[PDB]
Amino acid sequence: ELQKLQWAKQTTSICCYCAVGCGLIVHTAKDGQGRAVNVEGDPDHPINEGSLCPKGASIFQLGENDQRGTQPLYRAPFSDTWKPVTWDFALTEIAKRIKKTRDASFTEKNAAGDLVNRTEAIASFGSAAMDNEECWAYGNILRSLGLVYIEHQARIXHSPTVPALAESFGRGAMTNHWNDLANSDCILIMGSNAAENHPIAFKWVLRAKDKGATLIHVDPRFTRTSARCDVYAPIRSGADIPFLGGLIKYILDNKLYFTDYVREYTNASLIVGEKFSFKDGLFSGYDAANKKYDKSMWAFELDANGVPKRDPALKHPRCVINLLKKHYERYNLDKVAAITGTSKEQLQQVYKAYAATGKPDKAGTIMYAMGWTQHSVGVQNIRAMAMIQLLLGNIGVAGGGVNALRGESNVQGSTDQGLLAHIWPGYNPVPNSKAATLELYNAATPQSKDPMSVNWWQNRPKYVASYLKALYPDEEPAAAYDYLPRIDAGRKLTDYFWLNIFEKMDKGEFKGLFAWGMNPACGGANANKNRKAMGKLEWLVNVNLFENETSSFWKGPGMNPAEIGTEVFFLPCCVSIEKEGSVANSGRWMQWRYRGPKPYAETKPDGDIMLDMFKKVRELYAKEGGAYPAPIAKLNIADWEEHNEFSPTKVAKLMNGYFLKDTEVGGKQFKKGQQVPSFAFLTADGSTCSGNWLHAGSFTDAGNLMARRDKTQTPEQARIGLFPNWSFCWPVNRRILYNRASVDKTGKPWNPAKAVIEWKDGKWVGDVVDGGGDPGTKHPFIMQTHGFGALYGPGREEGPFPEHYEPLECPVSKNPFSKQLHNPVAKAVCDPRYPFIGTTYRVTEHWQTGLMTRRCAWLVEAEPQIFCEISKELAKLRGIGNGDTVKVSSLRGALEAVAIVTERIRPFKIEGVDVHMVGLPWHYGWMVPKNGGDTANLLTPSADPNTGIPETKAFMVDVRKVWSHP
């Protein structure tokens, strides 16, 4: 026996940092009754096989940490000191701060007499860091209190990624999964530093290479990822659409696209209406005054049934494919090399390697995460990736996909639970004020007259009904429909989002903030303005692990606690290894983890904090009346608790769903009390509840499928590593999305050596088929209205084809592709005192604002202080030496950092001029550690109307040497 682990109970867990979803083994002293003694990798987990990066490897130090919170801290208006206080107090006082603010601000009717039943005085940020069951409960709790201003982390990647991938494929999710990367023949890492930001991913990236894959990194900087790729191509910041457009041109010109895949499975053959055109950088239907498109000018020509017309010959000059060829002819190698900075020879090198995956026996994958996709045309960047993949037949196949890497451990799940302003759980929209009934709500769901188009969203009413029968199971859905708040149909949707929540706060338009598992005082762009804006709050509830820059903004740099009247509750939650629940990784793997040690001191699971905070409000309403008691009093919270505590097990069973009465569905009988086996057996009539239709199939009568730890694989399964018996993925354990596109019209795989599915003896064999139906009988994109992968995507604000509009404002004046310089649907000052492009990015050792990692002495050991990475050339121009203290400044602020001078950064040649990029990590903040430095968001601007997202990847700065004594 190893002494350290003897008499310690062993439990499994899942990493509480990035979306790879690495397995842990936790050892807890006194056969479970004591503290953790050891945390390391789970050797049996199929993703990390025992591996951890330094963040995961240091979880022991995060958990067993005496800087952690012990109990609630109250800070009084104008006070300059915390006040240790009990839970029963803090919640009782918070319940009162909610009711008062709600009562005073509740509006039953908007300024048009439309029913809204909402509070606009309270806002909530968070959180991707909570369990799926805590995320689902939290969204329902906030909405029953009638909030609409509900946002978290997801917003920054959601806004670019989900619309681009949904327009293209019909879902917003990562198309494949981590293990599947090993099956790829060519891996294009572009807008990702995955060796640093998804490190276990490289286990599977390097196994791809072992079996002959070419690895390509396209990045402004040379990083730890670059050092282990076959090809490193530098790209100028924001030149991605030119680079990708050149690849589309190259693939089309050299007949490198996979014709049979393109003809059957994409909209290549659909006939666009004659109203469509593109001249001088503008699509038809442009409103020059309002800077917006009439998208009806982009509509397909329809047949006598309302189905889009098609030429299966691909000869009609208004075939999507011929318009695609015409559009990308401009993107020749010489102009793409000029604007990107990439050599003509490298462009040919990369284009030739990646385009070869067009062959059915080769697979290419594109990995991107955040990069610079947040700007106006970021959506078009990702659309271009989808279009390249659809041309090359890489969607639906092992080692293909658009691997849009999620950030946080449960950002997929937190999004799935609808902690964003515009969605309920399961991506059912939040009603607008014109959606006056449930009948009108369901009306919004487009229908298809095509018999081959599954158009699965036509099932929406069954899901919206089962969601309402989970929240209010004695009420009729149509009645229940009235309890939940609604947004203004008049108002621009982005007015409810992250960025406007910050502008509103600064104009004092909010009374109360929930910073639940987020650090806005560091994570918000333009931190000076945001720390100031928080002053204008009456009250602030912060739920986290440690005291932080958010909880304690009232004593931040330059602040007068006396002058500042904001009332602050700090509620300390327990770490991931101290609670039970599920997290949903980037591959949609919903993985169950267990308690090791009991919560440290008097910390609580988020589940118990929110449930107890709410039950106080429920109480206090039931004995003082007010506002609108219906939602609060009727919300079913019995199903959430067991033995006086939040029950992850019962919330997960509710989210899956159960039959509220005996029912017959899909030619089978089910009994009252029984679990729904898949979302196929949900109903609109009230026979079923389900908190989240995506979760229907995850916790059946057969048990908790999320908790499966079974490596059983068939030969065809093991060959591409589906691991279908390890945990569970939405939807219904489909591991690779769009997998019907992996086979021809008989159900033979295009690449049998790496089959995903195969029609064998009246069965689909391998992965779970993505859409039921005999071979050749259904279009393969079942969540699409028309059923195809969209090369031409008419729902996009900037046009149905990606087009280069310059996202760099200050140093660029010329667009070589059109007469339209900037985004025609889109104010930067460009002050000459700040001539350098500032950028922020991550390092392997730190997590987000650094709230978690700046408290872990081993990570601070490795990366103790804010740094500033600059070229040798810019070091020479400013006489900076390696290790010198430097002042970085912008119109928004200034800070000190240690210079790192390196050839890993090079000047961009922009219009005959050398333009310098200056790099900073955003992992630092004033609280801890001593001499760490402050947040890089001192330097960043607040913003524009398109996005609802900040800018953190390109902002104009100066850097000056700070002088020592000789």
């Binding site: 190893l2 490190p199 490795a862 202080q865 290790g883 240690v898």
Partner: protein
């Protein structure tokens, strides 16, 4: 005897090995500051048995050659640290005959610290300024004898870290060297006859660190 094969052609410098070593032994963190490098702690010490060293070397064409060196005791077949210690006291530095682990005991407090370090051709041994004991990597010998991989080997995601019987590890080192040479023609194994920690360098080992080989 046991052996590590360390394929530095696969290292992402993720530094999971550096944290994993400290977590398994509950070693404290050093006081560190940035002096113009990601590298930290800047060197091995009494409380640091492994640090990843970073060196940037120019190459023609875009980018650099970034060299990563996860440094540790080489667990020499014939260790000169043992010879220099056996002068002042026997049993201070011992040899596990099952695994091959070279092990510093608490009797290193007795022997001459400086001289024992000077005799190491890899400059690995480190002395506590207070208790005058010597510390270094111990091959996680406790974990090895109970059938576990050393902390830094189990934690490594890339396939850089490998551990087992010296037979099949030498065989692998040769098989991998042949394959890596296709991409990195100057790829060589570090003193593969003399050590139990066999590094595959992608170029001149000295480029990684001055003491990378003896």
């Amino acid at each position: 005897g046991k052996m590590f094969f360390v394929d530095l052609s696969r290292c992402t410098a993720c530094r999971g090995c550096q944290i994993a070593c400290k977590q398994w032994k509950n070693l404290p963190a050093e006081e560190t500051r940035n002096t113009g490098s990601h590298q930290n702690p800047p060197d091995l010490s009494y409380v640091t048995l492994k640090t990843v060293r970073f060196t940037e070397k120019s190459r023609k064409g875009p980018g650099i050659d970034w060299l990563f060196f996860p440094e540790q005791c080489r667990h020499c077949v014939e260790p000169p640290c043992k010879g220099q210690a056996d002068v002042d006291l026997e049993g201070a530095v011992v040899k596990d005959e099952t695994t091959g682990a070279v092990l510093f005991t608490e009797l290193t407090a007795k022997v001459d610290g400086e001289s024992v370090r000077s005799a190491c051709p890899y400059d690995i041994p480190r002395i506590d300024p207070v208790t005058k004991r010597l510390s270094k990597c111990d091959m996680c010998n406790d974990r090895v004898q109970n059938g576990l991989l050393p902390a830094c080997v189990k934690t490594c995601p890339t396939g850089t870290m490998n551990f087992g019987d010296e037979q099949e590890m030498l065989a692998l080192a040769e098989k991998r060297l042949a394959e890596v040479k296709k991409t990195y023609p100057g790829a060589v194994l570090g003193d593969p006859n003399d050590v139990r920690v066999v590094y595959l360098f992608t170029r001149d080992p000295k480029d990684f660190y001055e003491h990378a080989v003896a």
